[PDB]
Design a protein around this ligand. Sequence first.
Ligand SMILES: CNc1nc(Cl)nc2[nH]cnc12
Length: 164
Amino acid sequence: GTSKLKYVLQDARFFLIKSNNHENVSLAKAKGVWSTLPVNEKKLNLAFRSARSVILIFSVRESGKFQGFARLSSESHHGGSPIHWVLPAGMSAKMLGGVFKIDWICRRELPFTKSAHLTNPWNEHKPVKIGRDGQEIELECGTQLCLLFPPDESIDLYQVIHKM
Ligand SMILES: CNc1nc(Cl)nc2[nH]cnc12
């Protein structure tokens, strides 16, 4: 069903995450962590304090798809055991140094062809697939986008609801 999912998404904020490779999204699904560049790290930390739920919606660049979405369970933190991100050219471990804990809500894929009817007011009403890493997605667009994903029957939202 979709009722607990809708409850988690109620009054949530949504951010598009654009990963340069599949490896880091796979690592994030395994370990429940994400790291981003400092400009987006600051934005996500602000949002985490401001809203009942902050949702990251993941897309691997050039994949033509979203790979799932997750809810922040912490602000970023440093000093943990270094996460073995595969680094793109020009990107270093130091500027992925802040680590967010996340709880996956859906680890299933959604092709961009299925979200072509959704436009993001915060990016000039371009299709929601379009946007830089960190682009915020307006509430209604983000809610509808998350509801398009196939159900992930491996996930139980009971614990996530109690973190709000
Ligand atoms: C683990 N974080 C990231 N990994 C990759 Cl491959 N690309 C990115 N662009 C913004 N953040 C990232």
